[PDB]
C-alpha cells in the first residue's frame, strides 16, 4: 500500500526512498537501475522493494468519507 | 483411545511399525523419497570421502543413541579406508557404521546380494556399482537408491 | 513418612519420658548400625545412592532427635547413652555419606551441635560434599520427593491462635532445647 | 545457580566417566559446532560430536569419549575454557588492528 | 607381516564420471601373469599412465586412533595407504586366481597366479603404494 | 593447535570502515567461528527499538496494527547500553522504568490548505501534515531521561521514512514504549542492514595462457581481475579481491581445463551494515564478546547430574 519501511530481507530501510526515486524518474529522466543505484539500493534484495513498489494508497486516498466532494 | 485396552491394541495391533508391508501383495509401503534418494547416490558414491571430524558427525546426527535403541551405551566406529596421506573414510562405511550402530550387537551382519536401478555404464569402465553387496553386515559395494 | 513423624515427635511431645526418648535412639542406632554393618558392601556394587533411601531417612530422624534432646543423651557420669559420640561418626564416615543426601538444614544444625557437643565433627564432610558439587549419583526425576518428604515436620510449630496455648503443655518449642 | 542449563544423559555415560553425553537447553549450532572444534582438539578426545534432536526443542546433544585420561566431564571443561581463551584472543587481535588501522 | 608386494606399471588411469576417484588398471614387471585393477582418490594420490607404482599388501603395520608423539609403523614406508576387506576369491584358469578387495568401496581386483598369490586370506587388509 | 599458534597466524585487514558500514577480512579463523560472530551480529546484538504502541485515536486509512508495525521498524538512534532489560514477570506498572524504557509520541491532525494554487496536484500545498515522517516522533523524557538524554536526544536514524499519510479531518494520536531486544526474537531488533561473509576468491590457472587467450580469459572475470603481462604475454591474476565467483570461465570448452577456482579457504570477507544506531565495528566487537560470554557463562555454571 505505502512504501515499506524496511527491506524483506537487507532489514536496510527503504521507506525514506519512494518520494526521491519517483523524482528521480520524473525530474532528472533517469532509468530505474540509475535511479536505484544513485538511492544507495545495491543487494537485488533492496532494488525490488523500490522497483517494485505500487503506491496504491494513493488510490485509497481518493475515498476520503471527511469531505464534501 | 480412552481406556488401557484400546491402548494396548493402538500400540500393537494397528501401531504404524509393524504394517511394513501391506497385506495387498506383501510388499513395502514405507520408504524414503526425493532428496533423500538423490542424497544416497550421491553419499555411497565412489568418490565420497569423508575426514574423522565430517564421519564421526554424520553418525551422531542421526543415530540418536539417546534413545531405545541402546544396543550399546558408546557409538561404534570403523577404521578408515585410507591411513595414509591421510585419515579418509568413505560413504559406504557410514552406512556399515549406522547399520552397525543399530542393528543386534549379540547377531552377525546382514547378507545381502542385490542390483540398484543404475547401470554400471554410468560410472564407468569396469565399474561394477549396479551390484549391491552387504558382507557381514558392511556395505561393501554398489551405491543405494529407490531399490 | 513415619519416620518423619517418629523423629517429629520424639523431638516435640512434652511429656515424654527420658527413657522413652532413649528408647527410640536405642532402637535407630541399633537399626542403623545393622545397616552398615550388613549393606555398606552394596555401595560400591552397582544402583545409586537412592537404594538406601531409608537409611538416611532413618538417620535423618535420629540426628533431628538429637538436636532436640541432646542434653538429655548425657548420662550421671557425663557419658553419652548409645555411645553418640562414637556412633555417630561412624555413619557420618560410612559410604552412604548420610550427610549429603539428608535434609540439608539438618544435617547443617546436627554438624554445628554435634560439633559442640565433641560428639561429631562432620564439617570438612560438608566441605567435601558441596566441593564435589561445583566441579553417589541419584536421579533427581524422584530424588526431588524425598528432599520433600525430609523437609515436612508434622509436628513444626502450631499457627492457630487457641489450640497453640492449649498445646504449650504438651510442646517443645525450639527455644526452650 | 543455574541448574537447567546442562544435564547429563546417564543412559549413555559409562561407569568410569570417559564416556558421556550432555543436554544443553537454550543452544544450537551456533556453540555447538564451535564446541566440538575445540574440543576435539583434545588430545586424549577419542570421539566428539554434537547433534539437535529437533528444530522445534531447544537443545543440543553434545558426546564425549576419552582415551582414557580424563574424564568425559574433564574434556567439556577444557574445551569451555579453550573456547573462551579463543575468543580473546581474536579480541585483542581485532582490537590491535582497528588501533593500527 | 607382508602378504605381498609386486612392481606395477599403469596402462590407463579413467577418472569415469567422478573426479576424485580414478580407475587404474595396471601391469606387474616381474609376473607376466600379474594384473591389478585399482580405485584410488587421486586428489590424494595422483596417477598418470606409465607410473610405475609399488604395491604391497599386508596383513597388519609393524585400534586406529589418530597419530601421536613418535608413532612408527609399516605405513611411514610409503605414500598412499588403506584399510578395506577381501571379499571374493575366483579361480580364473588351471593356473590364475582372482581376489577382490574393498576399501570402502574403492574396488581393487587383483589377478595373479596361485603360487604368487599363496599368502592372500579372506580377511582384512591394508594397501600400501610408493611411487 | 594451541591457542598461541592461532594468535600468531590470525590477521585482520580493514578495507574499508565507514559509520554505517565495514569492509574487512579475517585471515586464517574456522568457518565455525566465523559463522558464529555472523549469526550473532544478525540475532543476538541487542537494539532498541518500539515495542508497544498505545493508541487514543487514529482516523487514518491505515489501519493500528500496521501503523504499529512500521513504528517497530524505525531504527531509533539510541545506544543500547544506555538502557537495561526489561522484567517480563512484573504488572505493567512496575514493568517499564527509566532505565527500561524510552516514550515516544505522535501527534497529527490534517486540515485542508486554504492557500492552495488553485490546479495543485501536490499534497503539500493542498493539505497541511497531509505527509506523517519518523522525525514526527518526539522523544518525551522521563525522569531521570531528562539529564541521560539530555546530551543526545532520540531521534529515528532515517528522519525522512514515510510513515502514514492523511487527509482532512484524520489524526494520528499514539504514545510508544521502546525497550531492548534481539533480531532472533523478532527482526525489528537486529542492529543490521546486514551482516554476512564471502569466501576469498582464488582463481589458480593450471599452465599459462597467452595471445588472443590471454585477452579472451580477461573477459570471463569482471575488470581488472585478470591481467595480461607484458613480455611473456601470459595472463596472470592481479586482485582476486575484485572477483564475483559468475564461474564464466568454465563456460567456454578452451578454459574449463586449465583454470580450478577455489578460495583461500578460512579467509572470511566480512561485509557489515549497520541500521543506524551503533557503528558497524561495535557490532562485531558486540558480537565477538557476546560469543565469549557464552563460553564463560558456561564454563561458570555447574553441572546437574
Ligand atoms: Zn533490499
Redesign the interface.
Known amino acids: 500500500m505505502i512504501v515499506p519501511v524496511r527491506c524483506f530481507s537487507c532489514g536496510k530501510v527503504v521507506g525514506d526512498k519512494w518520494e526521491s526515486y519517483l523524482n528521480l524518474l520524473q525530474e532528472d529522466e533517469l532509468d530505474e537501475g540509475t535511479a536505484l543505484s544513485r538511492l544507495g539500493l545495491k543487494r537485488y534484495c533492496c532494488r525490488r522493494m523500490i522497483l517494485t513498489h505500487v503506491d496504491l494508497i494513493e488510490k485509497f486516498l481518493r475515498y476520503n468519507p471527511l469531505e464534501k466532494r | 483411545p480412552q481406556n488401557e485396552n484400546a491402548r494396548a491394541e493402538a500400540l500393537n495391533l494397528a501401531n504404524t511399525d509393524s504394517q511394513y508391508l501391506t497385506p495387498t501383495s506383501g510388499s513395502p509401503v514405507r520408504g524414503l523419497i526425493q532428496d533423500h534418494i538423490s542424497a544416497g547416490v550421491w553419499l555411497t558414491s565412489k568418490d565420497s570421502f569423508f575426514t574423522r571430524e565430517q564421519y564421526q558427525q554424520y553418525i551422531y546426527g542421526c543415530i540418536r543413541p539417546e534413545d531405545g535403541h541402546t544396543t550399546r551405551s558408546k557409538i561404534v566406529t570403523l577404521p578408515p579406508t585410507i591411513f595414509k596421506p591421510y585419515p579418509l573414510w568413505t560413504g559406504k562405511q557410514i552406512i556399515t557404521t549406522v547399520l552397525l550402530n543399530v542393528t543386534p550387537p549379540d547377531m552377525p551382519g546382514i547378507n545381502l546380494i542385490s542390483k540398484n536401478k543404475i547401470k554400471n555404464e554410468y560410472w564407468g569402465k569396469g565399474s561394477l556399482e549396479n551390484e549391491v553387496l552387504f558382507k557381514d553386515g558392511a556395505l561393501l559395494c554398489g551405491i543405494l537408491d529407490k531399490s | 513418612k513415619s519416620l518423619q513423624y517418629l523423629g517429629s515427635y520424639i523431638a516435640r511431645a512434652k511429656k515424654l519420658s527420658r527413657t522413652q526418648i532413649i528408647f527410640v535412639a536405642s532402637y535407630l542406632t541399633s537399626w542403623l548400625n545393622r545397616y552398615v554393618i550388613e549393606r555398606e558392601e552394596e555401595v560400591d556394587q552397582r544402583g545409586g545412592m537412592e537404594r538406601f533411601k531409608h537409611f538416611y531417612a532413618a538417620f535423618q530422624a535420629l540426628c533431628y532427635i538429637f538436636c532436640f534432646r541432646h542434653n538429655i543423651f548425657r548420662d550421671t557420669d557425663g557419658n553419652w547413652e548409645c555411645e553418640l559420640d562414637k556412633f555417630f561418626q561412624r555413619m557420618v564416615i560410612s559410604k552412604f555419606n548420610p550427610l549429603k543426601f539428608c535434609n540439608e538444614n539438618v544435617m547443617l544444625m546436627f554438624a554445628r551441635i554435634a560439633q559442640q557437643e565433641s560428639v561429631a565433627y562432620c564439617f570438612s564432610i560438608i566441605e567435601n560434599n558441596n566441593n564435589e558439587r561445583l566441579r553417589s549419583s541419584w536421579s533427581l526425576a524422584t530424588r526431588q520427593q524425598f528432599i520433600d518428604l525430609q523437609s515436612y515436620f508434622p509436628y513444626d510449630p502450631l499457627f492457630l491462635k487457641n489450640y497453640k496455648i492449649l498445646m504449650k503443655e504438651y510442646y517443645i518449642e525450639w527455644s526452650e532445647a | 545457580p543455574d541448574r537447567e542449563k546442562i544435564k547429563l544423559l546417564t543412559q549413555a555415560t559409562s561407569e568410569d566417566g570417559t564416556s558421556a553425553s550432555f543436554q544443553i537447553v537454550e543452544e544450537d549450532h551456533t556453540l555447538g559446532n564451535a564446541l566440538r572444534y575445540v574440543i576435539m582438539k583434545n588430545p586424549d578426545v577419542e570421539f566428539c560430536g554434537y547433534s539437535i534432536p529437533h528444530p522445534s526443542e531447544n537443545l543440543l546433544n553434545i558426546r564425549i569419549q576419552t582415551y582414557g585420561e580424563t574424564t568425559a566431564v574433564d574434556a567439556l571443561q577444557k574445551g569451555l575454557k579453550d573456547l573462551m581463551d579463543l575468543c580473546d584472543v581474536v579480541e585483542s587481535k581485532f582490537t590491535e588492528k582497528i588501533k593500527s588501522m | 607381516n607382508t602378504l605381498f608386494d609386486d612392481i606395477f606399471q599403469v596402462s590407463e588411469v579413467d577418472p569415469g564420471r567422478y573426479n576424485k576417484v580414478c580407475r587404474i588398471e595396471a601391469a606387474s614387471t616381474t609376473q607376466d601373469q600379474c594384473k591389478l585393477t585399482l580405485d584410488i582418490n587421486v586428489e590424494l594420490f595422483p596417477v598418470a599412465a606409465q607410473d610405475s607404482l609399488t604395491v604391497t599388501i599386508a596383513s597388519s603395520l609393524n585400534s586406529w586412533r589418530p597419530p601421536q608423539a613418535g608413532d612408527r609403523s609399516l605405513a611411514d614406508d610409503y605414500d598412499y595407504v588403506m584399510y578395506g576387506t577381501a571379499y571374493k576369491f575366483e579361480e580364473v584358469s588351471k593356473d590364475l586366481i582372482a581376489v577382490y578387495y574393498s576399501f570402502g568401496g574403492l574396488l581393487m581386483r587383483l589377478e595373479g597366479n596361485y603360487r604368487n598369490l599363496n599368502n592372500l586370506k579372506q580377511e582384512n587388509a591394508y594397501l600400501l603404494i610408493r611411487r | 593447535?594451541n591457542?598461541e599458534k592461532?594468535?600468531k597466524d590470525?590477521?585482520?585487514?580493514?578495507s574499508s570502515?565507514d559509520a554505517r558500514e565495514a569492509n574487512f577480512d579475517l585471515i586464517n579463523?574456522?568457518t565455525?567461528?566465523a559463522?558464529?560472530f555472523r549469526?550473532?551480529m544478525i540475532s543476538e546484538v541487542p537494539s532498541v527499538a518500539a515495542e508497544y504502541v498505545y493508541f487514543f485515536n487514529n482516523?487514518s486509512?491505515?489501519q493500528d496494527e500496521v501503523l504499529a508495525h512500521?513504528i517497530g521498524?524505525?531504527?531509533l538512534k539510541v545506544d543500547p547500553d544506555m538502557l537495561t532489560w526489561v522484567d517480563s514477570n512484573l504488572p505493567d506498572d512496575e514493568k517499564f522504568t527509566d532505565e527500561n524504557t524510552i516514550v515516544l509520541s505522535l501527534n497529527v491532525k490534517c486540515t485542508?490548505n486554504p492557500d492552495a494554487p488553485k490546479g495543485s496536484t501536490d499534497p503539500k500545498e493542498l493539505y497541511n501534515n497531509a505527509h506523517v515522517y519518523?522525525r514526527d516522533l518526539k522523544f518525551e523524557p522521563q525522569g531521570r531521561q531528562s539529564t541521560t538524554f539530555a546530551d543526545c536526544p532520540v531521534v529515528p536514524?532515517?528522519?525522512?521514512?514515510?510513515?502514514?499519510?492523511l487527509?482532512?479531518?484524520?489524526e494520528i494520536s499514539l504514545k510508544a514504549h521502546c525497550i531492548l531486544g534481539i533480531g532472533g526474537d523478532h527482526?525489528k531488533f537486529?542492529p543490521?542492514?546486514?551482516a554476512s561473509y564471502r569466501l576469498l576468491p582464488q582463481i589458480n590457472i593450471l599452465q599459462p595462457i597467452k595471445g588472443e587467450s590471454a585477452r579472451r580469459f580477461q573477459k570471463c572475470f569482471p575488470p581488472g581481475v585478470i591481467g595480461i603481462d607484458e613480455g611473456s604475454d601470459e595472463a596472470y591474476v592481479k586482485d582476486a579481491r575484485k572477483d564475483t565467483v559468475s564461474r564464466e570461465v568454465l563456460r567456454y570448452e578452451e578454459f574449463a581445463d586449465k583454470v580450478k577456482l577455489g578460495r583461500v579457504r578460512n579467509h572470511f570477507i566480512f561485509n557489515v551494515?549497520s541500521?543506524?544506531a551503533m557503528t558497524p565495528?561495535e557490532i562485531?566487537?558486540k558480537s565477538?564478546?557476546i560469543?565469549?560470554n557464552?563460553?564463560?557463562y558456561?564454563?561458570n555454571?555447574?553441572?546437574?547430574?
Not at chain 6, 555454571?301 to 547430574?305: E, W
Open positions: 593447535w591457542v592461532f594468535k590470525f590477521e585482520v585487514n580493514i570502515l579463523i574456522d565455525s567461528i559463522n558464529a549469526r550473532i482516523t486509512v491505515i512500521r521498524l524505525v531504527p485542508r519518523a536514524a532515517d528522519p525522512d521514512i514515510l510513515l502514514a499519510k487527509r482532512p479531518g484524520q527482526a537486529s543490521v542492514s546486514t551494515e541500521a543506524g565495528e562485531f566487537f565477538v564478546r560469543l565469549k557464552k563460553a564463560e558456561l564454563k555454571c555447574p553441572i546437574t547430574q
